[PDB]
Write a protein that binds this ligand. Structure first.
Ligand code: TGA
Ligand code: TGA
Ligand code: BA
Ligand code: BA
Lengths: 394, 386
């Protein structure tokens, strides 16, 4: 309402999703369209993205939650963010062009994990400040969602003109804006509080129950398959458009409009989830997941691929809250700590290391639409197996 | 549009007016409110400010224009700017508190002239880069005006909390930002003694000089310590700087908006009338400040400074352009606008500073408001006709 720390972190949510909004959606276009990198090479890039995510994400889930609460980690993340443009334009870009991809990927994910493994730890850090004060994390998260939307259109429109200055703008937002939010720093009943910790015996007891294994199979079979599908979908999407400018213009307009569609539906989504149930609503996401990949295998027009892109926005709430309420309804509260780590974060990244290579090589071999039928078949395949992930009903 | 040197120098306009926006408007408040310096002492500080300006400004007008074009001078200015905070917090601040003002003023203006005499030379150096390329100086100067406005509100709001870190921010802005702009690296006039001697032969200069000394210097001195007088009308110490921060920021947006449409007015009214209009609004503010009673009344007096500026910037330009030979313009700016104004401001700052200690702010404001309006009435007859 008037909380001084609220604006400190509300703008921090906005100015981080500014740099997040610049990098992530326009990352594959910057590799193929701009850096002229092949489909197999991009497959190697995204495999290394998932590898550093598998290493750094569990390290931050133990740090930020326990010792990291003293703002030390958040400064390190900002230290990398300050040198956003003098990395892509000066270090990252030429290392890829050097034709040695193996040498290049290592140095590439060192600044890459600040968004992949970095963001959940930053979102967990602002989750703690919101619980300490009056302001709610839900309204604080929405402050940043507009920053993701504002950039997506601005980068999409200004890309073909000069992508170099949009990168040169993001680094500045981490420099002139992020530091200002850092110098001005820091009996209670919480509405939602997750003060959890994990151990080897907690994980060993989690391995005793088959519930985890059937859940893991959905995370690997369906989710990882779909997550890999989106890694290089942008290049396939842009191809359907009249010009090179027409591709990025519409792709910029879609992620911006899609975010407003996502937040609007994610709002009314818990009402639906509670009536459908955790298992059934999770499978609702799996159908709208696989229908997009399998629909992409027969894609013919530009307005047809626009309709396919929006499906991703109908999918997200039924999997964000869908995964939450499943663990909440089918697992002990104490186990939730290992669950996110073991399945949601470890098994998903391990599957995404190999799946990204195989699909990346499939675009080089059988093409986009060719690979989409293979991945669309397996995602729908595991979705049909997920109907009987507990016991055979009657 | 896409000029690589435009962004390298447009941001240079922004990040300099960042440090300019920190120092200049909040300089008197840092002396009286913070350093606890008297009105007579501040009068001595501003006299030394005008003395180093009278010495360094003519030296840079000959350097940057001729030899200085090889970026050597711009590097020296940045060398002082890097040590902005380790000067005010470490050297300048204690020297004043060492209750020896004479010893302190000398060392104070060595970094002080980097903004007073420094800025016109920086604005002239960048005027040359704009002339060399596609991008225009008019749009490049505006790039920096937002930097002056962004800081003014940020310093005004954060001052009472910790003024030490805002100073610690400006020095870094010259360090991490200005150096990066250095790795990535028409008025062609000259002046002489005979040009200046031919200038003294014509009475036009003397009548113009009298307006620059009588009216302008009087008004410029008035603003040197007005901020302290303004902050007094406000509910708290926080209320003074908050509104003073909001006013210079809003006033800049009001100034740029009106200076845009101003040349249209000037060309219809004439050069003399533009100066006569600027002088009336100048003296009315000073004389109005002598009877000031409320906080929203002083806010209205502060905005009048923003109504005045275009009628004197372009007002002075078109007068020389319309009543003097193009060759003479080089000396004109040095002789009256820069030398006579600073010489008058050396003594006027001492006398007015001593007047606040003697007859107070409002008291001094009637003496200065009477003379400024006095010279404005004589400028109706003295100044060269339209
Ligand atoms: S750490 C949160 C970032 O996740 C992304 O958030 C944006 C904008 O808020 C969109 O919701 C994307 O779908 C998420 O991947
Ligand atoms: S070299 C600049 C001196 O002029 C001042 O510039 C600031 C920043 O834009 C404002 O225009 C002030 O009104 C001027 O005094
Ligand atoms: Ba949570
Ligand atoms: Ba000029």
């Amino acid at each position: 309402l008037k909380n001084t720390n609220f604006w400190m972190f509300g703008l921090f949510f906005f100015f981080y999703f500014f740099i997040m909004g610049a990098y992530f959606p326009f990352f594959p276009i910057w590799l193929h369209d701009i850096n002229h990198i092949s489909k197999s090479d991009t497959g190697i890039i995204f495999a290394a993205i998932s590898l550093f995510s598998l290493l750094f994400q569990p390290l931050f889930g133990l740090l930020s939650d326990k010792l990291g609460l003293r703002k030390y980690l958040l400064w390190i993340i900002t230290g990398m963010l300050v040198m956003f443009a003098p990395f892509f334009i000066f270090i990252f870009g030429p290392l890829l062009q050097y034709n040695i991809l193996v040498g290049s990927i290592v140095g590439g994910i060192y600044l890459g994990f600040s968004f992949n493994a970095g963001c959940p730890a930053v979102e967990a850090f602002i989750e703690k400040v919101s619980r300490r004060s009056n302001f709610e994390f839900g309204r604080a998260r929405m402050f940043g969602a507009v920053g993701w939307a504002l950039v997506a259109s601005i980068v999409g429109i200004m890309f073909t003109i000069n992508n170099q200055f949009v990168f040169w703008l993001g680094s500045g937002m981490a420099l002139i804006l992020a530091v200002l939010l850092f110098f001005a720093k820091t009996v209670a009943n919480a509405v939602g509080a997750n003060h959890s910790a994990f151990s080897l015996k907690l994980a060993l007891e989690l391995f005793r129950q088959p519930k985890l294994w059937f859940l893991s199979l959905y995370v690997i079979g369906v989710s990882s398959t779909y997550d890999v599908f989106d890694q290089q979908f942008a290049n396939f999407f842009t191809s359907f458009f009249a010009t090179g400018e027409q591709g990025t213009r519409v792709f910029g307009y879609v992620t911006t409009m899609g975010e407003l569609l996502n937040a609007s539906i994610m709002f009314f989504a818990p009402l639906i989830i509670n009536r459908i149930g955790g298992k059934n609503a999770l499978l609702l996401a799996g159908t709208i997941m696989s229908v997009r990949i399998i629909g992409s295998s027969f894609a013919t027009s530009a307005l047809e691929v626009v309709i396919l892109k929006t499906l991703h926005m109908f999918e997200v709430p039924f999997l964000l809250v869908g995964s939450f309420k499943y663990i909440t309804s089918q697992f002990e509260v104490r186990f939730s700590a290992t669950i996110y780590l073991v399945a949601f974060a470890f098994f998903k990244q391990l599957a995404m290391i190999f799946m990204s290579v195989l699909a990346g090589n499939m675009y080089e071999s059988i093409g986009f639409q060719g690979a989409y039928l293979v991945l669309g078949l397996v995602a729908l395949g595991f979705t049909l197996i997920s109907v009987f992930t507990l016991s055979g009903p009657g």
